[PDB]
Amino acid sequence: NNKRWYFTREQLENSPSRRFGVDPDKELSYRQQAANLLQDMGQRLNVSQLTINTAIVYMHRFYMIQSFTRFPGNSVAPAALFLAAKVEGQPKKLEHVIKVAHTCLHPQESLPDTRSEAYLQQVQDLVILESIILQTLGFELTIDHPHTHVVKCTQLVRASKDLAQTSYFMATNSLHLTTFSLQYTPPVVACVCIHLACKWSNWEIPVSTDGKHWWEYVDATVTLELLDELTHELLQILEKTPNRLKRIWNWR
């Protein structure tokens, strides 16, 4: 179904992590930690933002089936990034992913010998974990990201380079900070990303000649009652993240 990897607010409440004792707020912190580890490793492994975003969407869907208690975020993410890299045309070598994932999680520890018994186990553990990720996702590996719909929508509102970059910023951080990717379609999230970016930059797209708003031309199911509702949820958790809003704040 097209309703397989999309959930309701009651579905997300009864997540598999909830059934093992993880609080609703404790689980969002676990997802945010994994995305930061995926971005940290991805920035070190020199993969595109698309690859990282695919591994994050894998992680978001992976814990809709599995629990954070049985699978820690520090273990699944290096295996999810290794899988997303191979799928997204930027394959990273297995011994390279473990190299970067080590100094990311253990900056002080030294990497064990490549011929040691412990190193050969985590090499097996990542492959085992990648196989479980594939099995968990049902081998559904194609991911649609809001970045494809943001560029297609900022072009037709004649937004400047600045506002289009801010809408792109809202997209990367919606995958880091919210479960929007588990409830709303990429065309809907892209509308939420552009709406908050416009509210942030005091940019106001006027109504077209047909009395139609700009979001109707992207997705008919998008309403202003929904846009303000989701841009409010995204903005709250953005206000909680340190140094995140400083990157898009106008100091002039």
Place this chain on the structure above:
Amino acid sequence: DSVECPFCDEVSKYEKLAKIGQGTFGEVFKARHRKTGQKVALKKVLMENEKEGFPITALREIKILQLLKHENVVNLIEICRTKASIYLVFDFCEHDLAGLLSNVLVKFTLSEIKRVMQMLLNGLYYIHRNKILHRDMKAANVLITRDGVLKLADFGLARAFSLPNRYTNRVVTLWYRPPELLLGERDYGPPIDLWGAGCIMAEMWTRSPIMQGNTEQHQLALISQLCGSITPEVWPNVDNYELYEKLELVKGQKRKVKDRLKAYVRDPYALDLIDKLLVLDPAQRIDSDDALNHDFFWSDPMPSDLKG
């Protein structure tokens, strides 16, 4: 270790019946669903020397077979696990093109041959419009169901293409390989599969491949002995090729396309379409859209459903 797996049922849900794949083309099984009896085909994802976890090529094949849902392309039901090893679950098409051609008991009428090439060109058109190259066009990869529906199969060597590309040159079997690949072209596209489509169309009347080369030089010589020598007047700007100065090939050949295939092919429109399919120049080779509009599929006898 006994993991929760809702969206990946165990391959034990099917009951194996007989092997349909030996040696090079992996190990394939004809299977039967243990409840509905639906006939399927299972292919174990081979884990030979995969020091990089799950094979990147198995990822590419699975991703392609999930995008391509068409009446003339094989259907990926699902991907199953074991009690880790991975199986590909296909719908079972009983017959293949090569098996029917090499069987003297099987006979094709001109009307049925029109239907086979129309389903193959429609399948190639669908996969080309979906930005997918097959890169393994041959008679053994073309299957026909017991209902008479032709299916394109074996998308392992298949890759996506976009619009200076750097693609893989060691693709397609030697007997079905286009002249671009033999000359070492790494920027190729859809017409490489349409070249193999012409080698299949002629194979319908000859019951055997037409250019059975042994080496890469012997294949390029066989191509020139049938489709004329590789001339810059026939192939505008064939000059830039690395192997164009190092070819060592025949130079005074003239297109034996319609002459040598004249005995087996009786229809005038069929020979005219084969001539345009086996064109030396990729930019002048007929494509999937024009070939389906060719007068071969619109003159008597018209295409008919398959029964023999």
